[model samples]
Target: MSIAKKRLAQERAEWRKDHPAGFSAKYSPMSDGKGLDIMKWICKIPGKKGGLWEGGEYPLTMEFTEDYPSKPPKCKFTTVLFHPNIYPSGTVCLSILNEDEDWKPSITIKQILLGIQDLLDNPNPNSPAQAEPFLLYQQDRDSYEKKVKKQAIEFRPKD
Candidate 1:
């Protein structure tokens, strides 16, 4: 089996132990589109409770190449999101997601999801992904909060 498929299967077998409250995840409808590509996966992460992103279940696409362990998957939001570290196209700009940066083979899907969850509340100012939200965040806290709240409601998961 391919390393990506093997690792994911292994994780499923072991099962997730625990995570922060209000946080949950599941394999998206197209976990691996196109039959065993195992290259595409959708991971939905919840907004941290009591935080600006609370009550939202954000969907992110994880696209991995056969290189996998030697490389990190490309993680992007399914919809345009408002965040300093997320581009207007919903691409995440976290250092851990960048292969040339902090990304390492040791990173796990759990770690990636958790890191993304943290980034929702703690955006890295040094690397601004988009200007609208970033600029608004710097100049208008109230507006930024409102914009976030709107997206949170819109992106909330449906049963």
Candidate 2:
């Protein structure tokens, strides 16, 4: 394998070994379980949001490029989420995902995961994924929170 591929393999292996229980990585498949490109990987959030996302585990996918730490990874929710930064389709739009801001070589995979978790709890209206959600959040905070709570309750994992 090429040096970059070798390095990625080593780093992934180390990440697997270091992460504790309840943490996992899953490559996205085009079909039920097949794909050539590493479409995405799912990471399960460890705790509740204590608000709308409370009592549920959120699944997020990360897409890495050849540049990796030199560039920010693309992250999005795989499951339905009702947040300003998360679209109705579950794609997340946050500053951290931007190539220009909130990304640094010092950042790590673990840090990215943690940052995503934080986003779930705290959505930024200044940079929302959709205009409607942002407007709703700003105009009617109670209704927005209610909708989010309802969505969370409806989609809460049964385990």
Candidate 3:
């Protein structure tokens, strides 16, 4: 395997050894998975308890170039995520995901998922990606919560 591909697979395997609670990731070797060690990845992050996004299972598509680690991967949600930090196009706006800003080669899927989990509740209002969700979150928290509830049910696990 290519060096980058091997590295990514190794990291992913290590992550699989002990994934964090309230989340699950899938890619490669599975009947319904994406990517190989050489290819990019598709991850799944579940919402936490007692949160607006609880019961939701968010899918993130990751695209990595050969320059991974030195650079970074492009990750976007496969489903609509109604959050101020998530764009209408399903692009997630986070500091760790930004290479020019806070990204580091040492960052792993574990850290990324944890960060996304934290973002589900504590959104960054200053850096708004989508207007509707951001405005709702800012102007009417009740409405925002209601909308989040609907999405939570919409994206929950099948079984």
Q: Per-prediction TM-score, please?
A: 0.85, 0.77, 0.89
Q: Whose lDDT is higher: candidate 1's or candidate 3's?
A: 3
Over 4 Å off, model 3: 28-37
lDDT of 3 by residue, 81-124 (tens): 88999988888888888988889998887888888789888999
Assess each prediction's global lDDT (C-alpha) against the native.
0.80, 0.68, 0.81
Candidate 2 lDDT, tens digit per residue, 1-159? 444345456556777778645455655565655553453466776544466667666777777777765777677677757677888777767666677877776565666666776777677867787666678788998888888777767655676
| Residue pairs whose backbone atoms clash in candidate 1 | none
Query: Between 1 and 2, whose TM-score is larger?
Result: 1
Residue 15 lDDT in model 3? 84
Q: Write the per-residue lDDT of candidate 1 for residues 63-108, one digit (tens) a residue.
A: 8777877788888989878999998878888888888999998787
Cα RMSD for candidates in order: 2.7, 3.0, 2.6
**Cα deviation of 75, candidate 1, in Å:** 0.5
